[PDB]
Amino acid sequence: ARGPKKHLKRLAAPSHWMLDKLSGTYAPRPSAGPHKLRESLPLVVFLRNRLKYALNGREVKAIMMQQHVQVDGKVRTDTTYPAGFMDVITLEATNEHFRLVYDVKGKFAVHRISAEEAAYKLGKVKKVQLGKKGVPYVVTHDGRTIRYPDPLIRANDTVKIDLATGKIDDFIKFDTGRLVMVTGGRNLGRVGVIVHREKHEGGFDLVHIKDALENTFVTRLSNVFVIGTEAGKPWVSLPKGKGIKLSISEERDRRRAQQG
Amino acid sequence: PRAPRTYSKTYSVPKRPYESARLDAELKLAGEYGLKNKREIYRIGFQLSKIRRAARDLLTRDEKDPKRLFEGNALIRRLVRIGVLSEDKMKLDYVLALKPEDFLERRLQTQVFKLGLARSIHHARVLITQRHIAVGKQIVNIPSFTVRLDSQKHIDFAHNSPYGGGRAGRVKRKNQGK
Amino acid sequence: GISRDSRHKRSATGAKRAQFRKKRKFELGRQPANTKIGPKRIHSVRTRGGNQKFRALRVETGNFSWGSEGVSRKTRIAGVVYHPSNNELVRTNTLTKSAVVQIDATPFRQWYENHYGATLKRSRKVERKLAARSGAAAIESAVDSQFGSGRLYAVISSRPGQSGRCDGYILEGEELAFYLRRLTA
RNA sequence: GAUAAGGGAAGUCGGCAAAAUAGAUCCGUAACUUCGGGAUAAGGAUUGGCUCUAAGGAUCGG
């Protein structure tokens, strides 16, 4: 109606932000950016609701206006900047590096990483095509455009971005046996290897994935993210739980043993 | 606006208002437990009716059903924890056999009277309401407080209460100060 | 104003539809350019997204292509001789797309004679280059005959009310024979 | 035999006399009905001149 919306009602916010109902009428509307609104995590949510460094939105803005927060090695001062999957957030004042990777419960884990691993990131190739003057380029899942990619790189592949020069270190071809994290649907956050890709021309290709505990699930290729060349060899540190889904009874047993 | 806040009723009235058998059973049960009104009996019947409904729903499922095992064990565990269900009756078939007196046994007022801290059940209610009784190190003035098994041994007079080592109350201080 | 919405129409079953909402700006139309022939007059139109369209109200020349020869030249437009949509556009000389027009033949005749040497003082190398291009210099009779009148048949390919250009290609082959039959009748 | 400001039957037994309408094309047409009508009901639009365009045929030739 006459133009873009600028507000986000609290109840209409993505559920994986884990916002409380009664704290207010509105929720942080993520800005336009590398990641989609529904699949992002604004820095205000990360710094106040997750890390609890800031006590309120005034404080998260005070933190970010002092140039502390970096996303993918670049300073961001937008409190609603849409950080997303595989993004690296650096707070060198506290000497902390985080990567936004889904945990098996469907949420963005607070996943601390070493400084050496915080120097790169992975990106799922969305499309490969030719730019002006016949220069090929790759579009990753976070909207990055890398020119002159390896001519072997195709869609659904994973590239390793140097994240300081923006170049491609090396890549992983999408194929059977590759380590995968699921980035959408009800299997979001699970980690396994590709068992069989079932093609459907004009429809949605389906990928069969086997967990490390030999559990098999099916998910859309659009929800499939290659993160490693084989089982047990991920190119990034996995969050606690290793993307292994436990039943609610198993979780209850594990909590009973963990707590006594 | 802000998201709505949930609320719900905790009782339900009988369909037939005047029935001597139910009226006599209710009055006998209220007299036994020193209850204020019939609504405190309706509340027990309501929550037992929905405990039974949940157990019946799980009992229609096959044994070894993941949902029956998970929610049945949780419901049994909760009832054993609050002392309503005995430790040798953890079968989800004795849950259906539960009765409102099992729940009224576990009220704070009943436990205060049965621990000897009060002369009668009506003394128990006024002791609770007048902030004399503490569970653990926390004062509880709600008579319907359902006492847990781990809380059973920690029911005693408040440390700052006249009956529990505190200073003398208003009346005594006014009498001995004149 | 002019609206392109489908709400005002009656359904495929014939039912009249009730009025759903007021006319929206994202479904507007505008008025035809009705491009004529005369000294160039072009008005810009501010379109959706801040983009620009050009109403050619009057044009004299255009870019016309000789497809077989692979050559394009800017030449005057003489008049409109045939229009498959409405004969009143022929009568009033209104330039739209797919209008059959007569274009000045001189730039193409000049290119042809300079390129091949025939009609419709040189060095030895130039004469040899022309001799090499010979044999391919024989064009269709129906096209050759027009050069006597100095005017070639062409069809407008651009949309003058959209781009301000009145461009086209020279009629050839059975398409030229087709419109020749249409013209003679 | 014509015309007439403003009003428009107040004239008169009574709209007597006069006025108004009027051809053609297209649109639209009520009650009632013996289903045949009523009906040109009622009520509307157009119409010149000029320059064009289109459609509608005959006899011969396989």
Place this chain on the structure above:
RNA sequence: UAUCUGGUUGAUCCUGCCAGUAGUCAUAUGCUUGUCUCAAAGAUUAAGCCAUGCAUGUCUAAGUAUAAGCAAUUUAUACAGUGAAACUGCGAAUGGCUCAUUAAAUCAGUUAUCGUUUAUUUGAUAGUAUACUUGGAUAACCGUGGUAAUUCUAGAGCUAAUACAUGCUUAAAAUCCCGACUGUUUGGAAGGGAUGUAUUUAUUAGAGAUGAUUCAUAAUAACUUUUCGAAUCGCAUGGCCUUGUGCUGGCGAUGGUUCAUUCAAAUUUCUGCCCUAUCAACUUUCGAUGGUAGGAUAGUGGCCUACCAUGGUUUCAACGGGUAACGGGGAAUAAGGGUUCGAUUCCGGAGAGGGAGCCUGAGAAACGGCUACCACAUCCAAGGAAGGCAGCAGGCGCGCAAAUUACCCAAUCCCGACACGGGGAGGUAGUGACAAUAAAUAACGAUACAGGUUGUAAUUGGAAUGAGUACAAUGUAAAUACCUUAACGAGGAACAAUUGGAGGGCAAGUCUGGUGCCAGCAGCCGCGGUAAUUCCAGCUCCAAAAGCGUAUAUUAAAGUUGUUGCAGUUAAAAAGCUCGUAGUUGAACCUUGGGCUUGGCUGCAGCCGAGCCUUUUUUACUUUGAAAAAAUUAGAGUGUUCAAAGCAGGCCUUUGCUCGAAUAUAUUAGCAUGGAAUAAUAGAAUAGGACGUUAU
């Protein structure tokens, strides 16, 4: 709790309704009201009308400062700090409100854009064949004003830009076209043009991407009232000497073309809406269905135009009419199946008195924008001018029916040039028995009696406490309240519980007085004519209780709407009788049995799965899966002191460690998938039939 009870009769069994009964996130109203938490609230009738005030503004070192503003002399005589007014930029298209319109419309789920536009964010992307830096306007400002009146503005004099309008600076080649001359068997060439990117055609790659393209991209020939390839701003001030205002260069602001991305938008596939036939034919003049060409649009499309066909929908309910109809998530009630509701905390749509047309802009057919008409309506000096509360508060009116013209940006978020400003968005308090949670109005002894070692009935004591009041601290932007807490604060503990009833249904009097078929009661049956169990009262008792009653609607009861699941001989109801189209429904029959090996799970058997050997076309249905917003529902965990809730929280007390924020359900349609019973469908009958994998 899968429940019934009273009323037809002299009595009986039925049919059957009336009446009773319970709930309502269901409204109003009557009576009553002590505490804590939570909280709806001018929807219904009038999308009726509105006084007044507020609800949208906005500046960083980084666009423009000669304020004749303030401030200090300082690294500064171009400016330098702060900073009104103005120009410029951006926002004002979000939010908030309401539900009038709207019945294949909206909407829901599911699709598409190889059918488009897209400010902004985020990535990439431009060496292209006067320069030590171009012009002339204008505002603010000064001072002359005109009008009764407005956020009206007019002459005149200044002056700026990231405003406006123009304009150079550059690699190395190489390629193509014309081509004087020349070689002279077809080569060499001087000299001219053209190369980036945008636009528009025509002709060529495209034998890297897609399921698929005339896709991406490139090339050739041109075209263009020629797009833009920085005449901008802040901080640092470095390096090389050929010490000349020499040559070079660091972090940033802002901007810019195209592509991508993101926020969106616009169209769009399939299936699905309540009552009505006392609506059976509708659409097609003057677009109805389709074809061709064009115009227009951001783009597809009868969206519009011209020409041409005569199509398109319909008893499988079209079209018309009604709706006290915005749709959905949901709500009430619920054994199951259902019935009813959804103006209203979220999503989509629509509107801003009724229509219509536009400007600006990326985005509006915007109304706290404009223009005009209609209806209302304000000031007027009578010439004119200004309006739009279905935003917040408030008023009138309407009515059965709904609150303060309060405080604040502290939180949630949004907007802006932005760490700073603004926000009736939002939050806070006020009113508030809409609903919901918890929960006081007393407890315990001794005598005296009655009584069978203890339950009371009275007159005698000493304890206890919060309702209330208050220092104070906390809470809070500041308060209020809550939570804590000195001192005060209970015997008739007058610190006094009410609303309905006492014939039956239906729990509780055959007490006393009054009246006397009156007055009245009574949902229904009935009561009242002088001992009224029913009226009016006193006493007593009963039910629920800070709540209780009444009216209306709705749900259960209702197997009195019946698919589950009614009835039709006589209680209502088999068409007078046959035919008959749609619809519904339709006999049986086609791989069964046997054998061997093996995996798993239940306690030798049993139950599922397999794998071989035995001659070995279309659906419907059902399984599983993918994708399916939150809130609500169910449900796991968790001592909000309990609870309704909430999504918290827990650890020996932590310059930190640490479980969490589950899980189900949705269900028609679509998508993918396993199975082949059941029910359809097709095949080889004038053979135009099937196989020849390597038949000729």
Place this chain on the structure above:
RNA sequence: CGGCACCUUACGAGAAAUCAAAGUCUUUGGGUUCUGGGGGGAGUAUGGUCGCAAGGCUGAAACUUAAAGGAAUUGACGGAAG
């Protein structure tokens, strides 16, 4: 074999009278058409349609009402029989 019926019984049904269908219906599902939803107002008014007409077919509502009705029992009565 087909009909028109009848007699007995009640497995069964039914409120009963009664019923070989009015059975195989809470142990509720062979196929299908029509009709009813307390008594009146009322098969009335209105609209339509058919008919020459008489009328047929389709067909309400306001309002009103606690019964109307079915089968059977005992009695009372009968210008009914014995």
Place this chain on the structure above:
RNA sequence: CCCGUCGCUACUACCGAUUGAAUGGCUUAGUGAGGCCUCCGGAUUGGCGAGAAGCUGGUCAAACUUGGUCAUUUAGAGGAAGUAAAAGUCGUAACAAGGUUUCCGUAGGUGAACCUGCGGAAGGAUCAU
């Protein structure tokens, strides 16, 4: 026990001359504001260009008048009903073989119930000679 005219009171709906009346939507025709596009125009204002008022023709089209239609309310002399109230007048149609068995369809007649003809039914007063 009971039916129907007739009489009194009250209520509800109906018909009805009045080409009755009022309110709202849609629409033919006529008239037609305003914006937008277009066509010229050319106050004045820069060095040929910019350009205001206005003009031509279109386009979208509010709004008014008439007519038509749809929909919702409403007056009416008089006419003709229904129900409630009381059991007022006249009779006695039904319930018994109700004293002429009753009822159905149809058609006449009549203060009223009703009577009569024709053909049916038993729900008969006969399951039978």
